[PDB]
């Protein structure tokens, strides 16, 4: 594959470098169209910039917390973090979000990796070997209310049991209801004057609940859970303007008020180098 062909002097009626950008087209002008060039080869395929590679690596998409402690007298297990849940979404942590939002529609399979790390902030005689249970609770499935509900039986919901300090790994097929996931959605759930706007109404993927299976020890253990997402078998459509301003909320395109200029201001002239 040639990068540049050999091209010499020129004196024509054919002017490749004069165009009309109001047509909306970006004419494929090459260096050999405006200067004398020599032959060079690409020695390059562009593998690393393939959308499969671009979205094909794990990125942290959520961090949450649960803890192992005596549940005696706790009236709201959920609030006490005896167990916690995550309303599944990929737009909470901004790094992966900006990448995905480089496109309008996106379709792919997902590979999840869940890392659980223990912590004992105050006096403990040892570190306990806790087992985490991550259960997927799809829309319509009964949500856990107590860390040891009948819901954790998980007869139909899928769930993994892994050691804290260890990692959990599994993949999920493309689960969108449509032919592709929407990164943006200029619409509502119905024609209502007050209903929510944006993908907020589209990305209703249920949530996944986490808990520590072990009963409590004398001391209290804080387990932090990090979920990583890697896309595979990727397809992307309709490229768009990259995000410029900071995000403020999951799902909305909203940006903060009194935000700072994102375009750098010259320390001098428009003639400055």
């Amino acid at each position: 594959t040639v990068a540049s062909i050999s091209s010499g002097p020129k004196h024509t009626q054919k002017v490749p470098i004069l165009t009309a950008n109001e047509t909306g087209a970006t004419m494929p002008v090459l260096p050999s169209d405006s200067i004398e060039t020599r032959t060079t080869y690409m020695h390059f395929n562009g593998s690393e910039t393939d959308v499969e590679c671009f979205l094909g690596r794990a990125a942290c998409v959520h961090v949450t917390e649960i803890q192992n402690k005596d549940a005696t007298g706790i009236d709201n297990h959920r609030e006490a973090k005896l167990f916690n849940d995550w309303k599944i979404n990929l737009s909470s942590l901004v790094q992966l979000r900006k990448k995905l939002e480089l496109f309008t529609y996106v379709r792919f399979d997902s590979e999840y990796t869940i890392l659980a790390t223990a912590s004992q902030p105050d006096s403990a005689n040892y570190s306990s070997n806790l087992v985490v249970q991550a259960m997927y609770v799809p829309p319509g499935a009964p949500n856990p209310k107590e860390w040891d509900d009948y819901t954790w039986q998980s007869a139909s919901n899928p769930s993994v049991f892994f050691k804290v300090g260890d990692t959990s790994r599994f993949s999920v097929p493309y689960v969108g209801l449509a032919s592709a996931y929407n990164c943006f959605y200029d619409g509502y759930s119905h024609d209502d004057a007050e209903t929510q706007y944006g993908i907020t109404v589209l990305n209703h993927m249920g949530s996944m609940a986490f808990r520590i299976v072990n009963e409590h020890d004398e001391h209290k253990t804080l387990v932090k859970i990090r979920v990583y997402h890697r896309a595979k078998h990727v397809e992307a459509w309709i490229p768009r303007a990259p995000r410029a301003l900071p995000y403020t909320s999951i799902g909305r395109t909203n940006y903060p008020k009194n935000t700072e200029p994102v375009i750098k201001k010259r320390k001098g002239d428009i003639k400055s180098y």
């Binding site: 009309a20 950008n21 109001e22 047509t23 909306g24 087209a25 309008t104 529609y105 969108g176 449509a178 032919s179 592709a180 996931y181 929407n182 990164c183 943006f184 959605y185 200029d186 619409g187 509502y188 759930s189 119905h190 024609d191 209502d192 004057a193 007050e194 209903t195 929510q196 706007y197 944006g198 993908i199 907020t200 309709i238 490229p239 768009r240 303007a241 990259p242 995000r243 410029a244 301003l245 995000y247 403020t248 909320s249 999951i250 909305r252 395109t253 909203n254 940006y255 903060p256 008020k257 994102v262 375009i263």
Partner: protein, 255 residues
């Protein structure tokens, strides 16, 4: 003697001519088409009114002044009250369509100004309030009037900073979307053919706007010494390959 500048577009019983065009853009190089069996899900036989809805509808003219920020229309919203197309929109549960957008603006070889005409699929607007505030139905359904980017914020409405495309992205990058410029010194019209773009075969035409059309002044308007400091901008849109499905009662929408 055929030129990129002279064109005629005939849809239904409506025809458009322009002697100062700059070619025409066909979004993602795809001409609109009807929904093929292989992609269909909805089992209802669809209705194709053809020429009674696939024709040019001219919106109300806007006035471009030295201080204009830009305008934003949404489809199919902007045509929600246009003849039979509009009626079909509310009488059916589902619908799908493509369009030919034709923006007009003439001046003289003494004027100067440059409008960016772009089509943005799934243009999800942002709330000027930031945080997690939503943008109420009415404010993204301005209809034929469209949204004036130089108008003041309003409760429940979207942010209207031209610089941030009403969505947190920079104006300069709007060119990644199918667009065209109306550079008075070259142009006087912009034409964009839009194929149906969505993640579903067919969809509700009232609760979802597939794309929004934006006419944004980049190089400000300049009129010759002592001339009227304004120019009109006219938007004409024609639906094409329009299909309606699931006919019934007729929606009653917010406001």
């Amino acid at each position: 003697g055929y030129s990129d500048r002279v064109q005629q577009i005939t849809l239904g019983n409506s025809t458009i001519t322009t002697q100062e065009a700059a070619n025409a853009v066909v979004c993602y190089a795809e001409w609109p088409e009807y929904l093929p069996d292989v992609d269909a899900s909805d089992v209802n036989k669809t209705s194709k009114p053809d020429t009674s809805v696939c024709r040019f509808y001219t919106l109300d003219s806007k006035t471009w002044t030295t201080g204009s920020k830009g305008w934003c229309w949404k489809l199919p919203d902007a045509l929600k009250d246009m003849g039979v197309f509009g009626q079909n929109m509310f009488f059916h549960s589902l619908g799908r369509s493509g369009y030919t957008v034709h923006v007009q603006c003439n001046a003289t070889k003494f004027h100067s100004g440059c409008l960016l005409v772009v089509v943005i699929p799934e243009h999800q607007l942002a709330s000027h309030e930031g945080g997690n505030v939503s943008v109420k139905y009415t404010f993204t359904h301005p209809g034929e009037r469209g949204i004036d980017l130089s108008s003041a914020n309003e409760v429940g409405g979207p942010v209207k900073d031209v610089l941030y495309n009403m969505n947190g992205t920079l104006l300069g990058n709007l060119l990644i979307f199918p667009h065209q410029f109306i550079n008075l010194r070259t142009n006087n019209t912009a034409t964009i053919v839009i194929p149906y773009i969505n993640s579903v075969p067919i969809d509700s035409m009232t609760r979802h706007n597939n794309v929004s059309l934006m006419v944004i002044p980049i190089a400000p308007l300049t009129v010759p010494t002592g001339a009227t400091p304004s120019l009109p901008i006219t938007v004409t849109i024609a639906p094409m390959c329009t299909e309606f499905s699931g006919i019934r009662s007729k929606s009653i929408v917010p406001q």
